[model samples]
Target: PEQRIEKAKGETAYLPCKFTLSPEDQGPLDIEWLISPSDNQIVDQVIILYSGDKIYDNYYPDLKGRVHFTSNDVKSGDASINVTNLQLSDIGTYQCKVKKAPGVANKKFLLTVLVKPSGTRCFVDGSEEIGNDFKLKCEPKEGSLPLQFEWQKLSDSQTMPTPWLAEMTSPVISVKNASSEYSGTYSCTVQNRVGSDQCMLRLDVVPPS
Candidate 1:
């Protein structure tokens, strides 16, 4: 089970749970959803055999209006559920319980909320501190030639001057003593004989302890 999600405070997120179950249709079975840290309680009502819908009580009020079956296709045995309008407090262990003919199956999953973009970013490896020597190599994957490079100071109020701190017709640039002043916005402006692409990086001066 995954533990927590690292995100900025106010943001929208989608929490997903995926599992496959094989149910034996004999008597009526109930599928219950419960949150951990609290005792076992039903997420939804006990799913019945004959009833097309669910019925239950004792669901948390905050979750009562917010929870719904993602979908119920008994034939495929897909009991996955999706919760929306996620707040930071909704982070916890969610379990799915199934009451089938002879026994019950309990499957648990974790949901995490993230504020950061769920994507890959560019980074410099082993970028040293102020006095120490370091290298800033532009490894742009989505850019081509005629790239301009910039290294700015990351302080209270910062801005990039024209012509950049440095310029490179290619994608590779280097700097020594990668200090506090060297730690601001690093932008790569790539232009062909026609159009151009610009990407930036906020370099942090990770000094040695």
Candidate 2:
């Protein structure tokens, strides 16, 4: 009923669905796999199904060849399917509907496909003046949603913050009354659920004229 599985994009996802053929449940077996949008569960599109004699695997064009039953012989009460080469659009709630005469059951499960982070850019937004405020900016050029940007200054023997001084979990930071000590090689790491990327920028607080 309530199930969730998370996997990275381009990986395979195994949706589990099984039935217990009770002693008294006797009728023509039918199995259907459907995808229900997370936003709107009321509307669903059937992806595949199996009748008594033949299997229908061409219902949805998007999942046409990528989806297949783990075990084609559904008479034994297994309707689980395997989806290969998962994409962002493949993340959603899946429904496995099974029926055998008066006996019927449905299983709903969720799938999450994560996209790896990459192309992180780090830069200085404000001038590195001795008394003026400065801003260190870190952003992802291309990555999936729910990305977290962490900034740190890479220096000699000092441990990194994922921030500088008050660092570890912010995309941007402001330094007031900046000094030469604020000058160094700063790194910004962009992270997501599955992967991380980093970029660095050097801010040289020039001597006052």
Task: Please tell me which predicted candidate would have the highest TM-score against the true structure.
Answer: 2
Model 1, residue 5: what's the lDDT? Answer: 34
* Candidate 1 residue 65 C-alpha distance from true site, Å: 1.7
- Candidate 2 lDDT tens digits, 36-77: 765445457898988875688997776769998888676787
Which predicted model would earn the best lDDT? 2
What lDDT, from 0 to 1, does candidate 2 have?
A: 0.80
Off by over 4 Å in 2: 38-42, 142-150, 155-163, 207-209
How accurate locally, in lDDT, is each candidate? 0.50, 0.80
Count steric clashes of candidate 1.
Answer: 3
User: What is the TM-score of candidate 2?
Assistant: 0.85
How many clashes (backbone N, Cα, C below 3 Å) per candidate? 3, 3
